[PDB]
Amino acid sequence: MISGILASPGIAFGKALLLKEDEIVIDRKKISADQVDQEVERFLSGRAKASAQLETIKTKAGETFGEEKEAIFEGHIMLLEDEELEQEIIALIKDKHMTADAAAHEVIEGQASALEELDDEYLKERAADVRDIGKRLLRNILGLKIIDLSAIQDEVILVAADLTPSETAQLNLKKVLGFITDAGGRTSHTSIMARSLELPAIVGTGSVTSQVKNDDYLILDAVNNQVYVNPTNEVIDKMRAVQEQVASE
């Protein structure tokens, strides 16, 4: 069966919300000096947008967990608005005729890679949080569609290979029912939430994302540590009684 680490006990019912991501296609075409000036505005003014987006996520981190976590996202903006990283991006766009999408990808390529060369498991995890800041910056230049997990409209379960502080900082715990992630870390951020929020959850699912799909009907037991996919009405009716018999006790 599906054995995870079990974060907290409980039973919930809901449709599976799988978090997939659309692959981004960067154009490696060389532009002309007549399109370079336009890229700077699309890149400079673009930052005006990404700055407003990450900024809005910053307050959701302080209004959701408390200004105590705003210090982490506060630095995430200084790096994005870094006046130094901007002069380097600009040059490439003007010197190597690179697209704001391509050039910006170059600097972000050494930021994450260079962080792996550091001798600190901490700055390393920042590498993952940094790639997220770059990927978002890209979808902002192409104005690509973004998933709005901050405004769900249907109560469902949350399933994902893993969730980064940002996803957890914008997640709306107003219509959520539970969290399931492929993180087998006895100290995974997901668990810290499921643990502090006392809600029931699991994280060592491992590869449930390779056996489940979005909209799939699931039933979390968090009692025997097992996920049931499309069970018979005989097991549901039997669990609907016991489970609800608990809330009634």
Swiss-Prot record:
It comes from the Bacteria. It is found in: Cytoplasm. Phosphorylated on Tyr-122. Phosphorylation on Tyr-122 is important for polar localization but not for interaction with TmaR and for activity. Changing H189A: Very strong decrease of the affinity and catalytic efficiency for PEP. Inactive. The active site is at H189. The modification Phosphotyrosine is found at Y122. The N-terminal domain contains the HPr binding site, the central domain the pyrophosphate/phosphate carrier histidine, and the C-terminal domain the pyruvate binding site. The reaction takes place in three steps, mediated by a phosphocarrier histidine residue located on the surface of the central domain. The two first partial reactions are catalyzed at an active site located on the N-terminal domain, and the third partial reaction is catalyzed at an active site located on the C-terminal domain. For catalytic turnover, the central domain swivels from the concave surface of the N-terminal domain to that of the C-terminal domain. Enzyme I of the sugar PTS has been shown to phosphorylate NPr of the nitrogen-metabolic PTS, though much less efficiently than it does HPr. This process may link carbon and nitrogen assimilation. General (non sugar-specific) component of the phosphoenolpyruvate-dependent sugar phosphotransferase system (sugar PTS). This major carbohydrate active-transport system catalyzes the phosphorylation of incoming sugar substrates concomitantly with their translocation across the cell membrane. Enzyme I transfers the phosphoryl group from phosphoenolpyruvate (PEP) to the phosphoryl carrier protein (HPr). Can also use (Z)-3-fluoro-PEP (ZFPEP), (Z)-3-methyl-PEP (ZMePEP), (Z)-3-chloro-PEP (ZClPEP) and (E)-3-chloro-PEP (EClPEP) as alternative phosphoryl donors. Homodimer. Interacts with the pole-localizer protein TmaR. Binding to TmaR is reversible as long as TmaR can get phosphorylated, whereas binding to non-phosphorylated TmaR is very strong and shifts the equilibrium toward binding. Belongs to the PEP-utilizing enzyme family. This is Phosphoenolpyruvate-protein phosphotransferase. The lineage of its organism: Bacteria, Pseudomonadati, Pseudomonadota, Gammaproteobacteria, Enterobacterales. The gene is ptsI. The chain holds residues 1 to 249 of 575 of the full protein.
